[PDB]
Enzyme design. Sequence first.
Site, PDB file in Angstrom:
ATOM      1  N   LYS A   1       0.798  -1.208   0.000  1.00 17.19           N
ATOM      2  CA  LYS A   1       0.000   0.000   0.000  1.00 17.19           C
ATOM      3  C   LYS A   1       0.834   1.262   0.000  1.00 17.19           C
ATOM      4  CE  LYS A   1      -3.960  -1.871   2.496  1.00 17.19           C
ATOM      5  NZ  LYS A   1      -4.476  -2.096   3.861  1.00 17.19           N
TER       6      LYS A   1
ATOM      7  N   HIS B   1       1.153  -7.011  17.735  1.00 19.72           N
ATOM      8  CA  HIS B   1       0.134  -8.038  17.698  1.00 19.72           C
ATOM      9  C   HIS B   1      -0.429  -8.264  19.071  1.00 19.72           C
ATOM     10  CE1 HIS B   1       3.579 -10.529  18.905  1.00 19.72           C
ATOM     11  NE2 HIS B   1       2.681 -11.330  19.452  1.00 19.72           N
TER      12      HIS B   1
END
Lengths: 122, 121, 119
Positions: free
Chosen positions: B65, B105
């Site tokens: 991206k 995470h």
Amino acid sequence: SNAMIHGIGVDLIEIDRIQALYSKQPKLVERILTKNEQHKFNNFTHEQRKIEFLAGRFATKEAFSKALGTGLGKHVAFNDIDCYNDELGKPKIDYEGFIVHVSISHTEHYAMSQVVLEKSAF
Amino acid sequence: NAMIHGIGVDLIEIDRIQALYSKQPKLVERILTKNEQHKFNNFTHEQRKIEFLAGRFATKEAFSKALGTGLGKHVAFNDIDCYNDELGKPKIDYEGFIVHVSISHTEHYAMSQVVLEKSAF
Amino acid sequence: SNAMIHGIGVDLIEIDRIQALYSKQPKLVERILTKNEQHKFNNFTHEQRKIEFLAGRFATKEAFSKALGTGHVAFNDIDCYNDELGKPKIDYEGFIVHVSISHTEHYAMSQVVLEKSAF
Ligand SMILES: [Cl-]
Ligand SMILES: [Cl-]
Ligand SMILES: [Cl-]
Ligand SMILES: [Cl-]
Ligand SMILES: [Cl-]
Ligand SMILES: [Cl-]
Ligand SMILES: [Cl-]
Ligand SMILES: [Cl-]
Ligand SMILES: [Cl-]
Ligand SMILES: [Cl-]
Ligand SMILES: [Cl-]
Ligand SMILES: [Cl-]
Ligand code: NI
């Protein structure tokens, strides 16, 4: 050249919350959209897409407002922040005086957007 | 005259990666470069395996991206080599740019952000 | 010439884990929050807001630490305060620190970008 970072913003949105809000007050939720965004939204058929779109816009518009800071930007109207994707799929927002960098992501339950504003120092 | 070429972010649901790996392990491991595969092959715990894969999916997607090239240039996930510095800080090299990466995470989610900065020279 | 990015950091925190931290080990808060942050935390009367604050600050310190890298800073020496409009801020000699925090019911996140100081 003399580029510098003006400000950054991030926002995470729980899609289910937006689903609930839209079921309860669809018109009030749609007021965050610009005319162009409304036009796009009106062409959708499926509720899942509608909610993802809205959740993503809430996240991007908030991240942008946070990045801008200033009283001016803190109090920008969401329906004056026109988010779009360029021909390569890159999300964008035009704002005079800045180069606006945006990135978006979503999962089944969450939408997230980040914005970085850069400026020439002078 | 921008200093930033592009930014990217990606959020990944670990459970989805767990499901994908159980169903198509080989297809999933094809996202890894040979170097990444060497790391993966040394893991002995499933939890670590899925977290590694989820983190790589997120990082590779964020990097893609940040490039901002859409479907204009083809880049394979197995050509994006995410590695660590000697203390474990994630890195990716991309000629012509300074690449900044950060990963996080939780039990259920992995995320990654990438910033591509313009090189002075 | 353009300013330079020293490093970036991001952190995602599950609010329930922080709820468990505070309930089981409130004194750990002292190893995490600065004195200034502790002053604020101690004044909350609504527990949900209190945990959101702590989760957000923990995420911010982890993000800051990742952005700084190790080429060393105690969490209770990283003071994230807010300006008169609500914007989170950190001052750290040698850098311009950019911070953003976001919360949902179950998650807190923070991102930090460290830019090199010059003028
Ligand atoms: Cl939310
Ligand atoms: Cl309505
Ligand atoms: Cl649709
Ligand atoms: Cl869209
Ligand atoms: Cl996902
Ligand atoms: Cl397979
Ligand atoms: Cl292992
Ligand atoms: Cl967590
Ligand atoms: Cl309170
Ligand atoms: Cl203060
Ligand atoms: Cl913020
Ligand atoms: Cl928030
Ligand atoms: Ni470029």
